[PDB]
Amino acid sequence: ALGEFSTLNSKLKSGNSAAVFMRTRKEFTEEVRNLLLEEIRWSNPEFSL
Amino acid sequence: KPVPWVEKYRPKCVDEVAFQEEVVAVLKKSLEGADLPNLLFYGPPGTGKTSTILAAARELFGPELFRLRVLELNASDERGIQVVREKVKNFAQLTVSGSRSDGKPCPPFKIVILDEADSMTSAAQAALRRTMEKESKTTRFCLICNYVSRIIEPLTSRCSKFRFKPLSDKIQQQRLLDIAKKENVKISDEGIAYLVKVSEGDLRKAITFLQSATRLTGGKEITEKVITDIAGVIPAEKIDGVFAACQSGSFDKLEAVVKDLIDEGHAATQLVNQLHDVVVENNLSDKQKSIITEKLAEVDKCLADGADEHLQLISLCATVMQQLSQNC
Amino acid sequence: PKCDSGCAETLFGLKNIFSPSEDLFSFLKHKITMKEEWHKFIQLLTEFQ
Amino acid sequence: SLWVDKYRPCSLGRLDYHKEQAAQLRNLVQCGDFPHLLVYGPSGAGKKTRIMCILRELYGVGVEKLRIEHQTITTPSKKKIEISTIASNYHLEVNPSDAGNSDRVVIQEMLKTVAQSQQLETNSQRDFKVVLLTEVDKLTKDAQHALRRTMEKYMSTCRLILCCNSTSKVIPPIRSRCLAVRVPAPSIEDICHVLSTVCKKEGLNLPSQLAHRLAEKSCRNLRKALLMCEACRVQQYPFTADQEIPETDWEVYLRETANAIVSQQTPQRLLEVRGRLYELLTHCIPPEIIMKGLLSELLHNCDGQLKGEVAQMAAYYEHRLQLGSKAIYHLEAFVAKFMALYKKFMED
Amino acid sequence: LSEFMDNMSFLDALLTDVREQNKYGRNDFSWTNGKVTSGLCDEFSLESN
Amino acid sequence: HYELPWVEKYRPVKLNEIVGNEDTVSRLEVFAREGNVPNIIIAGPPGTGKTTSILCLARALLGPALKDAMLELNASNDRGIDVVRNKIKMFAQQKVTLPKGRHKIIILDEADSMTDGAQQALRRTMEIYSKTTRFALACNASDKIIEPIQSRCAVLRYTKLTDAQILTRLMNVIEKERVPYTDDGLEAIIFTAQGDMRQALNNLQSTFSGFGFINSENVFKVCDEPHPLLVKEMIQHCVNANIDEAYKILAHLWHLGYSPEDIIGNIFRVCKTFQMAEYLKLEFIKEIGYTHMKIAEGVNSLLQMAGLLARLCQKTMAP
Amino acid sequence: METSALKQQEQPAATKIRNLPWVEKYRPQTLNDLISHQDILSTIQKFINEDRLPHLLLYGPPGTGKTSTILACAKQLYKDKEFGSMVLELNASDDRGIDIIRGPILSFASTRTIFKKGFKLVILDEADAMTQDAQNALRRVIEKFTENTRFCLICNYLSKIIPALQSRCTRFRFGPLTPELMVPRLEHVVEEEKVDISEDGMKALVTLSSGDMRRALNILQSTNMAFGKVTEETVYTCTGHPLKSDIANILDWMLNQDFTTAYRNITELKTLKGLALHDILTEIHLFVHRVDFPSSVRIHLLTKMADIEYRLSVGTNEKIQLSSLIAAFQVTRDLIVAE
Amino acid sequence: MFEARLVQGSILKKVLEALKDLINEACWDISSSGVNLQSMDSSHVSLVQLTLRSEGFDTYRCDRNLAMGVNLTSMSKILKCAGNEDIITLRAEDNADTLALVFEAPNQEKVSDYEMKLMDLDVEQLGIPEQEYSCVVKMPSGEFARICRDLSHIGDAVVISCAKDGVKFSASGELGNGNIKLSQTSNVDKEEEAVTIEMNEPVQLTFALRYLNFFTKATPLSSTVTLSMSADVPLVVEYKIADMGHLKYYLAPKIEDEEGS
Ligand SMILES: Nc1ncnc2c1ncn2[C@@H]1O[C@H](COP(=O)(O)OP(=O)(O)OP(O)(O)=S)[C@@H](O)[C@H]1O
Ligand SMILES: Nc1ncnc2c1ncn2[C@@H]1O[C@H](COP(=O)(O)OP(=O)(O)OP(O)(O)=S)[C@@H](O)[C@H]1O
Ligand SMILES: Nc1ncnc2c1ncn2[C@@H]1O[C@H](COP(=O)(O)OP(=O)(O)O)[C@@H](O)[C@H]1O
Ligand SMILES: Nc1ncnc2c1ncn2[C@@H]1O[C@H](COP(=O)(O)OP(=O)(O)O)[C@@H](O)[C@H]1O
Ligand SMILES: [Mg+2]
Ligand SMILES: [Mg+2]
């Protein structure tokens, strides 16, 4: 039978996979970058950032 | 410079080997025709199979040609069957001219003496069978195994197979007397009997222990103590103390006895052997006998796997302890 | 900006096994009954072994 | 330069106990064609001092010079390994076990080159060079087979003393061609005698009560007895009969571990004991030593029917431990099964 | 959990590993060696694994 | 006119057509689209699509210059010290005019047959010419590659393929080939290909050339495995602890001539997905692994399978 | 290099007046003459005559007839004036490394033929002995030369061959030859050679051979020369295989007597007959499923002899293992006999 | 019963060094027509053929047809210790397993004799018909040696092409491409040979460097060499030794594949 020795299910998932990223990273401004710098400094207080 | 006694005192010729009659007859007939078959010697070790094949090769060939025309190899190689097959091919391919001044020319086929013939897998043995059929005419072999049963069937169908039953204790007692009188060492006959009974019918191990004992003592009297601890044989009152501790009802004296055995240097394997030898010939119940003996078997496996002697002996003594104290 | 946690399981190739919605420890914590989920857990252990 | 090596006997006649087999070794070296020797006994019983004494008796005192040489060998699997070996102009020293599954490799080539050294170096002293293989019980089966092939190829070229603690892992063909030398542990009185001897050799005088207590606490391990005696010397310049003989620190850490074992049976206790065994294994203690110590500790509180059960489960789990690779899993399996049994036992 | 440690002890001893442990040294946490440098020769292994 | 094998007749030419390991597929897609790819070590099971992904990535990144800016080494080539001395360095120094962001590409097909010193030589060459040259490698076991070769690269992992993906590709190829079939043949043809659909297309071609119709019986006549229903019956008898029939048909498989190893492997993959209790499944798996170690160590006899079966059967009766 | 000298010398080699290798007497010539595995041979004929021969992997236990089969196929495809120009025969006799695969194989598969135009063929006997890297180059030389030259891989152990190499070829298993088809062959040999043999002789000849006619001819040849008569006793004595009466008495001793008596009897019989405990374990396991026992007896007994067969592998004392073998029966079956 | 008298041993030394690496063994078959050798490669890609007429030898004697096989390595070891100016005797018995090489005295004071065992092997008479070749050229041997060793260090394979313009050599190596063009008007001054064609159609094939270098190991046999080449029937290298015989060589081309789109 179908799926007797494996996972052959009659139903198949469509649309869950093939999620293309197409990610466009906006260049960070001064303020958000400095906030991230202070987050790094608070994570590692012994580092000369 | 000197040689060990085992090859120094092995018989030169067939007919000089004792206790075997049909074997001597068929080997002598094959020597008369100068066409020795492919041999398959099976029997307990030390029975003289290597001595018989060396004597046969010494009779057929010349003593200077004997070592030239024999190649002694073993077959449990850790590098596989391809290495020893390549050595066999090298030895058979390499041919040296040989003649005898006694008036009889040598047969063209050489001799490769391959021991431990019961120790290989079926695939390696089939590879050796292909090597056999490669050199059927130009070399005839002699395979020596402890048990003929492990031989796969194509080899056993083309080899003359010979049983070598162990020798009755009187004849190798006489032989060890011959060794002692020819090697000028002072031994009591009780010492020779004890050496026989710890040799367990192995003449080769007996004469090895004899030469080793006479070189330990340096000409002194070979006592029962030196032959007790040259074979690793445990003193029997130690076994009796182990059984008394198991009968006693205390685990503290049990572990004390085991500590006494281990700090004495006595190995666990020999202790298992003699414990088994006592248990098999006792008045103990077959239920207890069975439980103790299967415990002994798995303890033998455990110690062969690298486990501690002490732990396996404690667990073994605990099982024998519980089996004895259940009825009590 | 949004954080981008998850390079660790991507390094071990675990994103080739699980759904992008699925998390590693989240899949570990719940009860495994589905045959497909259990084959993915088998493939996970097969990758680490 | 501690007490065990500075005051080590150098010749056979300088041995203090077990004189008889020392004289038999003197007879063996007098015969001049000794075959391969296997020597065995518990640790600290004096095996290595007997070995080097028969070495010094065998050749001249050029045995007494020692250096260290390093050997780089390609594997048959083509992965070279580097090992450190002790060497002399007359003997070699190899402990092969550091190669693990490559022990077999460490079997041939050095000995082969020692054979080549016997073919190279000529001094007209004796017709072989001896090499001490240490801890031959840890040799694998194929390593022992390769050793058998080496010995049945080079019996006329080199010789070998086989220092071990048990001949169980020695396969019977190896036991067949090498002469057995059982070296039992010294008795209490022998330890006290050699201990007073080494104290007078140190210029120190102690009461015999301290010697007997130290001999009993050393459990017939003479090396441990001499080391501990030296520790007692460092503790106190004079020797008083009630001086506190110090305890081995990993032994007492194991004892406090066993106290945590018998005290409380909780999963947090299992995990913290697991961390303690992690600390022990990072301290490079062998797992069977840790096991023997912890079981000998915990058996004192065990009742009569519990002691035997602990015995077979300990032996079974350590059988798997030597079968296994990482000893952590087997040790934790034993400790958790003992948790189960012990918790099942006080509840009824 | 004790049954689980019995199982994982069984997986250490009485299951084989994909890569044979202590192939060139002994088990871990050993001061003897462990400096197993990779091979330096072009000749193939010619092994029978 | 020539019978092109379907494994190369239906090898994908565009990266999106490859299924399996879809996250790394999308990453390879965006690297084909933009470029400036780093050095790649693809590792995974054989027949997964590693060589296909590498070659399609190279084709998409190069285009017309694929005959010149690309060069390939497999185990069929020399791949000794002297060639990684001369040839690959000569190419890595060789000038090739390319579009911007596009680099010369070297593929080492199945680098597990590189000798150790060959990799030791390859490290400096691959790391110094990184401005104009990128390296791609494939392997099955990552440990056969020495550590600095990993340490100078990005390593990516491939997995055994999901059965739904294999089913889609097989219905695709039988649609493009007009193959008469049943579902029985589909589960047979996939069971013979555990996540490696190179086996699936191979045994599909074998079934179609040998019988012309796809059903379970044809697949097991050409692949010649022990039958899945027989071993399902074995473990079902184990659930009933019925020793007689299970041993009878095990002896039937034995005198049928199947090796110990594929029988124990099939026993594994059948009691894996069998519908029964999880604790007894755990016991069954550890027992069959224990017996498999017996075959693996050398001792492989009917007595071993009999003791296997007996301990399996006594697991049911003993709580 | 060479070793084809010895085979070519060996093919017309016999004394022909005194030597009688009847294993060499009866050789099939073609696929219509190899009377076994008819589906496989007809499939080969179909693939040959359509010019649709795929890459082949002939595997099975040795002696089932792979080499003679593919030799017949090679002589069928190509005539004797062009056989060396299109078929390359190699094996593991010429093992120098992986240089064989990138030497003669890679050079041979890279070229067209010499005299006449057609597809070529390479047979690689005992290809199980090829190393992993040699096979791993062999897969590539198959992939990039598949349209010119077909490949035949003769093997004996299917599992060791790497998955891609089995992937690029179809496979044919030469299974054991069924006894109902092998009795007429041995009856023909017996009637042609005037041999006296009883029904136990036929049963032992087919049981020991395990579906191999070569090994059967070897056994009957040896027994006929050694004794002049062939029966169960004569075959097993010439083979040095466990006699069924002997192991039956061994089973009787464990199932009737006590521990010590059966112990010493079996020990004396092993000394007397030269038996190693592996074969006793095999033959008693052959007796276990035949003799009527309850299910609990069967599982307990089978597990115990399985563990004994394990423990015998590492090389422990065979004496204590014999003792535990007796103990396995002593625990259950003799207790029920007392019951 | 077979006697052959090689007039000069230089030719035998030259043919042996010409075939020293090519073949596993030499199997000669002798007839009253002469001696022949059609032995085909261990890697199974090429064939050496040598036919020497009976009248070329000082004395050629046969009783019947005989095919004997000799291992090449020991044959080379024997012949490398022979003077080139010497007159050689090859003696073969009717049914014995040993061939005798009776070298006369190179120093005029020591006649040498060596023996060789016979190695049995399956040898078939590869009786190929000599079809009409679509491309036939004659061109000097030393030039063909210098150009093969030129292209060998460039390329692992050479593309031969024969056209109406002339004969043309390409080799696309990793260092780069190497091309050599000859012409029919191109006549050399080293050995005074005018390169000619008798061709019919242009043909392009590819051959490995190694075998062709060891075919040029047969350079000193003849001043010029005849190349015969067809679209299907493979490369033929033919040396015509003066009054001795002819030395044909069959080399199959590598397959060519079209690059995928
Ligand atoms: N994921 C896939 N999608 C589509 N076709 C595939 C896939 N995997 C394999 N194939 C097909 O099977 C063939 C084998 O692919 P390969 O990439 O060579 O396998 P691999 O994953 O590289 O592992 P190898 O080759 O054994 S090292 C390809 O040429 C395709 O025809
Ligand atoms: N079905 C068969 N019928 C008759 N003779 C057979 C049959 N199978 C094998 N033989 C004999 O086996 C000889 C050679 O068979 P092989 O092909 O060598 O066997 P194999 O299966 O290839 O395994 P090998 O060669 O022993 S490793 C033939 O000459 C026959 O005498
Ligand atoms: N029947 C016998 N007659 C004479 N000497 C014997 C006999 N049996 C054993 N020996 C002696 O015992 C030794 C046995 O050595 P070996 O031939 O290796 O025995 P096996 O081959 O059985 O192991 C021989 O050296 C021989 O001196
Ligand atoms: N007769 C003796 N006199 C002095 N010290 C001894 C004597 N015998 C043994 N010892 C000591 O006992 C210790 C045992 O160590 P070792 O020689 O390695 O034997 P083992 O291998 O049994 O530990 C040695 O350090 C040695 O100093
Ligand atoms: Mg690939
Ligand atoms: Mg075959």
Structural domains for chain H: 1-256 (3.70.10.10)
Chain F CB within 8 Å of residue G170 CB: yes
- The whole-angstrom separation of Cα H84 and Cα B102 is 48
- Ligand-binding annotation for B44, yes or no, is yes
Together in a domain, F182 and F142: no
> Do residues B116 and B50 lie in contact, with contact meaning Cβ atoms separated by under 8 Å?
no
Whether residue G299 and residue F243 make contact (CB cut-off 8 A), yes or no, is yes
- The whole-angstrom separation of Cα D36 and Cα D129 is 12
Q: What are phi and psi of B48, to 5 degrees?
A: 115, 15
**Count of B-D CB contacts under 8 Å:** 134
Q: What angle do CA D135, D141, D142 make, to 5 degrees?
A: 110
Tokens of B29: 């007939």
- The atom of ligand 4 lying closest to the CA of D5 is 27
Ligand 6 centroid from CA G65, angstroms: 6
Look at the alpha carbons of H74, H80, H82, H88 in this order and tell me if their dihedral is positive or negative. positive
Q: Which residues of F207-225 are buried (b: 16+ CB within 10 A; e: fewer)?
A: bbbbbeebbbebbbebbbb
Whether residue E14 and residue D282 make contact (CB cut-off 8 A), yes or no, is no
Residue B91 to residues B37, B86, G78, Cα–Cα distance (Å): 19, 9, 39
Which chain G residue lies closest to E47 (C-alpha atoms)? G131
Chain F CB within 8 Å of residue G292 CB: no
Number of domains in chain F: 3
Look at the alpha carbons of B304, B306, B308, B312 in this order and tell me if their dihedral is positive or negative. negative
Binding residue ranges of F for ATP: 44-51
- The whole-angstrom separation of Cα E43 and Cα E27 is 28
Question: Which of the listed residues F108, F141, F161 is the one where a domain comes to its end?
Answer: F161
Residue among D47, D89, D85, D49 nearest D65 (CA): D89
Query: G and E: touch, per 3+ CB pairs < 8 A?
Result: yes
Whether residue G133 and residue E49 make contact (CB cut-off 8 A), yes or no, is no
- The whole-angstrom separation of Cα G6 and Cα B274 is 55
Chain G CB within 8 Å of residue B154 CB: yes
Q: Where in chain G is the domain with CATH 3.40.50.300?
A: 19-177
Strands H235-241 and H245-251, how do they pair?
antiparallel
- Ligand-binding annotation for G294, yes or no, is no
Strands D81-87 and D67-73, how do they pair?
antiparallel
Residue F122 to residues D74, F80, F90, F114, H175, Cα–Cα distance (Å): 21, 11, 13, 10, 19
Domains of chain D: 19-182 (3.40.50.300), 249-347 (1.20.272.10)
- Single-letter residue type at B261: L
- Dmax (CA) of chain E: 49
- The whole-angstrom separation of Cα B202 and Cα D175 is 14
> Do residues D68 and D94 lie in contact, with contact meaning Cβ atoms separated by under 8 Å?
no
> Do residues D8 and D33 lie in contact, with contact meaning Cβ atoms separated by under 8 Å?
no
Together in a domain, F271 and F181: no
Resolution (A): 4.2
Using a 10 angstrom Cβ sphere, with 0-12 exposed, 13-18 middle and 19 or more buried, the burial of residue B227 is buried
The set of residues, in sequence order, having a beta carbon less than 8 Å from that of D124 and lying 6+ positions away, is none
Together in a domain, F241 and F301: yes
Chain C CB within 8 Å of residue A32 CB: yes
Q: What are phi and psi of C17, to 5 degrees?
A: -100, -55
Tokens of D196: 């007073």
- The whole-angstrom separation of Cα G233 and Cα G241 is 10
- The whole-angstrom separation of Cα H223 and Cα B226 is 89
Tokens of F248: 């009878």
- Name the region of D8 (left: φ>0; alpha: ψ -120 to 50; beta: rest): beta
Q: Which residues of D296-308 are buried (b: 16+ CB within 10 A; e: fewer)?
A: ebbbeebeeebbb
Quick one: which H or E segment has residue G150? Answer: strand G149-155
Tokens of D274: 């697991």
Chain B CB within 8 Å of residue G314 CB: yes
Q: What are phi and psi of D104, to 5 degrees?
A: -50, -45
Together in a domain, F185 and F207: yes
> Do residues F140 and F48 lie in contact, with contact meaning Cβ atoms separated by under 8 Å?
no
Whether residue G112 and residue H252 make contact (CB cut-off 8 A), yes or no, is yes
Whether residue F24 and residue C16 make contact (CB cut-off 8 A), yes or no, is yes
- Cβ neighbours of D74 (radius 10 Å): 15
Whether residue D325 and residue E17 make contact (CB cut-off 8 A), yes or no, is yes
The set of residues, in sequence order, having a beta carbon less than 8 Å from that of H169 and lying 6+ positions away, is H147, H151, H158, H159, H160, H178, H179, H180, H181
Residue D243 to residues B16, D223, D246, Cα–Cα distance (Å): 72, 20, 9
Residue F47 sits in which domain range?
A: 2-161
Together in a domain, F197 and F151: no
Residue among G101, G150, G95, G141 nearest G123 (CA): G150
- The whole-angstrom separation of Cα G324 and Cα A21 is 67
Which residues 293-312 of D have a C-beta within 8 angstroms of E? none
Quick one: which H or E segment has residue C28? Answer: helix C24-29
Which residues 20-79 of G have a C-beta within 8 angstroms of B? 62
Chain F CB within 8 Å of residue E7 CB: yes
Q: Where residue F170 sits, what CATH number does that domain have? A: 1.10.8.60
Using a 10 angstrom Cβ sphere, with 0-12 exposed, 13-18 middle and 19 or more buried, the burial of residue D227 is middle
Together in a domain, F77 and F127: yes
The CATH code for residues G19-177 is: 3.40.50.300
Tokens of B16: 């000089």
Three-state SS string over chain B comes to CCCCHHHHCCCCCCCCCCCCCHHHHHHHHHHHCCCCCCEEEECCCCCCHHHHHHHHHHHHCCHHHHHHHEEEECCCCCCCHHHHHHHHHHHHHCCCCCCCCCCCCCCCCEEEEECCCCCCCHHHHHHHHHHHHHCCCCECCEEEECCHHHCCHHHHCCCEEEECCCCCHHHHHHHHHHHHHHCCCCCCHHHHHHHHHHHCCCHHHHHHHHHHHHHHHCCCCCCHHHHHCCCCCCCHHHHHHHHHHHHHCCHHHHHHHHHHHHHCCCCHHHHHHHHHHHHHCCCCCHHHHHHHHHHHHHHHHHHHCCCCHHHHHHHHHHHHHHHHHHHC
Q: Which residue has the tokens 């414990």?
A: B275
Residue H95 to residues F113, H92, H113, H119, H125, Cα–Cα distance (Å): 51, 9, 20, 13, 21
- The whole-angstrom separation of Cα F102 and Cα G182 is 68
Q: What share of chain E is helix, strand, coil (3-state, %, to 5)?
A: 25, 0, 75
Chain F residues touching C33 at Cβ < 8 A: none
Taking the CA of G129 as reference, the closest ligand is 2
Quick one: which H or E segment has residue D73? Answer: strand D67-73
- The atom of ligand 1 lying closest to the CA of F139 is 27
Residue D30 to residues D24, D26, D57, Cα–Cα distance (Å): 10, 6, 9
Tokens of B66: 């004997």
The set of residues, in sequence order, having a beta carbon less than 8 Å from that of G140 and lying 6+ positions away, is F74, F75, F76, F109, F110
Together in a domain, F50 and F142: yes
Q: Where in chain G is the domain with CATH 1.20.272.10?
A: 242-332
Using a 10 angstrom Cβ sphere, with 0-12 exposed, 13-18 middle and 19 or more buried, the burial of residue F131 is exposed
Chain F CB within 8 Å of residue E43 CB: yes
Which one-letter DSSP state was computed for residue G97?
A: S
- The whole-angstrom separation of Cα B311 and Cα B318 is 10
> Do residues H19 and H48 lie in contact, with contact meaning Cβ atoms separated by under 8 Å?
yes
Quick one: which H or E segment has residue D199? Answer: helix D188-201
Ligand 3 centroid from CA B193, angstroms: 18
- The whole-angstrom separation of Cα D237 and Cα F57 is 80
Residue among D43, D75, D66, D60 nearest D218 (CA): D43
Strands G120-124 and G87-90, how do they pair?
parallel
Q: Which fold has domain G242-332?
A: Zinc Finger, Delta Prime; domain 3 (1.20.272)
Q: Where residue F138 sits, what CATH number does that domain have? A: 3.40.50.300
Q: What angle do CA G83, G87, G90 make, to 5 degrees?
A: 125
Ligand 6 centroid from CA G156, angstroms: 8
Together in a domain, F204 and F312: no
> Do residues G180 and G202 lie in contact, with contact meaning Cβ atoms separated by under 8 Å?
no
Three-state SS string over chain H comes to CEEEEECCHHHHHHHHHHCCCCCCEEEEEEECCEEEEEEECCCCCEEEEEEEEHHHCCCEEECCCEEEEEEHHHHHHHHCCCCCCCCEEEEECCCCCEEEEEECCCCCCCCEEEEEECCCCCCCCCCCCCCCCCEEEEEEHHHHHHHHHHHHCCCCEEEEEECCCCEEEEEECCCCEEEEECCCCCECCCCCCECEECCCCCEEEEEEHHHHHHHHCCHHHCCEEEEEECCCCCEEEEEEECCCEEEEEEECCECCCCCCC
> Do residues F19 and F168 lie in contact, with contact meaning Cβ atoms separated by under 8 Å?
yes
| Torsion, CA G310, CA G311, CA G314, CA G315, rounded to 10 | -130
- Name the region of H226 (left: φ>0; alpha: ψ -120 to 50; beta: rest): beta
Residues with CB under 6 A from ligand 3: B 6, 9-11, 17-20, 45-51, 144, 164, 167, 203-204
- The whole-angstrom separation of Cα F306 and Cα G284 is 12
**Count of A-C CB contacts under 8 Å:** 12
Sheet holding H157-162, edge to edge: H177-181, H167-172, H157-162, H203-208
Together in a domain, F66 and F39: yes
| Torsion, CA F143, CA F145, CA F149, CA F151, rounded to 10 | 0
Whether residue B321 and residue D308 make contact (CB cut-off 8 A), yes or no, is yes
- Cβ neighbours of F101 (radius 10 Å): 10
Three-state SS string over chain F comes to CCCCCHHHHCCCCCHHHCCCCHHHHHHHHHHHHCCCCCCEEEECCCCCCHHHHHHHHHHHHHCHHHHCCEEEECCCCCCCHHHHHHHHHHHHHCCCCCCCCCCEEEEECCHHHCCHHHHHHHHHHHHHCCCCEEEEEEECCHHHCCHHHHHCCEEEECCCCCHHHHHHHHHHHHHHHCCCECHHHHHHHHHCCCCCHHHHHHHHHHHHHHCCCECHHHHHHHCCCCCHHHHHHHHHHHHCCCHHHHHHHHHHHHHHCCCHHHHHHHHHHHHHCCCCCHHHHHHHHHHHHHHHHHHHHCCCCHHHHHHHHHHHHHHHHCC
Pick the CATH number of G178-241 from 3.40.50.970, 3.30.2130.10, 1.20.1050.10, 1.10.8.60: 1.10.8.60
Residue H211 to residues G82, H74, H129, H145, Cα–Cα distance (Å): 21, 22, 23, 12
Tokens of G275: 């038996």
CA distance F147 to chain D (A): 14
- Ligand-binding annotation for B191, yes or no, is no
